[PDB]
RNA sequence: GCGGAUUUAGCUCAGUUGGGAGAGCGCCAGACUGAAGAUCUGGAGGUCCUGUGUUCGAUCCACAGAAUUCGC
């Protein structure tokens, strides 16, 4: 058995289990014997780092990542998903939404868990106009979103005052989803009152 | 036309709360035997039907299509 496919299934019970040390010690342990670290084995190991609850691994996260491109390892879209998923546990939606941008000029067509963390981190801030931003970038990338995304978007337009901008994500919002659920039903009809 | 079941090795089929899936038979070799069956050991043998998705990761979870099959 290789040391390659022993580190691989390893590195699968670290996320199955959530153990963000055993897989930075894997980790270094892999790299001191020279165990060429697969494509598979970054993100797994990113994934791990970007597990939010205080983590260890959220300032190795980075170190691991800046390892991958100077190993010169092709990054997937779960790369910069899970690196998305770091920066804005760093409170950085700015470098999360940096990191969206990076993937499409890699030819990597982005999903929509790629958009979370940027998404979610601007209207937790406040910063609508940067959330919108976010959201164009997303129907530019024919990534059509769903009432978490939605809601959120309706959210951060109510609280800034942007009566305009909830009419119309209220809109898709009557496309997409048909039945939603309570938390941003009543949301709806409080400003709908109001 | 409608609804359900099934799709995994050359054949028959397992396996399931997701992290490189096996069995039985067959095929080839070993072993044994004068020789052969039998018994026993090992090996080769896969687009886990197809597409789109969810997931860090899909044979397994979601949707659609295709084929097979049973009832209307």
């Not at 022993?6 to 153990?19: F, H, R």
């Not at 165990?35 to 970007?50: A, D």
């Not at 009557?174 to 709806?188: C, E, N, P, W, Y």
Request: glycine share 4%; net charge neutral; hydrophobic share 40%.
């Amino acid at each position: 058995q290789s040391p390659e496919a022993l580190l691989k299934q390893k590195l699968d019970m670290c996320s199955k289990k959530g153990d963000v040390l055993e897989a930075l010690r894997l980790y270094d342990e892999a790299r001191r014997n020279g165990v060429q670290l697969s494509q598979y084995h970054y993100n797994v190991l990113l994934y791990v780092c970007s597990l939010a609850s205080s983590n260890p691994g959220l300032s190795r996260g980075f170190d691991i990542f800046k390892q991958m491109i100077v190993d010169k390892v092709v990054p997937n879209e779960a790369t910069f998903t899970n690196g998305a998923r770091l920066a804005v546990a760093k409170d950085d939606p700015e470098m999360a939404f940096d990191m969206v941008k990076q993937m499409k000029a890699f030819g990597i067509q982005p999903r929509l868990r790629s958009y979370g963390p940027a998404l979610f981190g601007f209207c937790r801030k406040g910063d609508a106009d940067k959330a919108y931003e976010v959201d164009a970038h997303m129907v530019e990338s024919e990534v059509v979103p769903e009432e978490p995304e939605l809601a959120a978007l309706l959210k951060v337009s109510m609280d800034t005052k942007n009566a305009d901008k909830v009419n119309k994500t209220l809109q898709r919002l009557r496309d997409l989803v048909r039945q939603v659920s309570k938390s941003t039903q009543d949301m709806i009809e409080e400003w709908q009152k109001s």
